[PDB]
Amino acid sequence: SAWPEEKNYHQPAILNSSALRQIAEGTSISEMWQNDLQPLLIERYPGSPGSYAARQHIMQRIQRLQADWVLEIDTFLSQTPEGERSFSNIISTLNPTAKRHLVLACHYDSKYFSHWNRVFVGATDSAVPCAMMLELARALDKKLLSLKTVSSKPDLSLQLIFFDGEEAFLHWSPQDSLYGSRHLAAKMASTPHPPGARGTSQLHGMDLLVLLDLIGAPNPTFPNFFPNSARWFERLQAIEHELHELGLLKDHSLEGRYFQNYSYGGVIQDDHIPFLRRGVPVLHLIPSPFPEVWHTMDDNEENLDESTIDNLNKILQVFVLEYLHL
Ligand SMILES: [Zn+2]
Question: Could you tell me the fold of the domain covering 1-326?
Answer without folding.
Answer: Aminopeptidase (3.40.630)
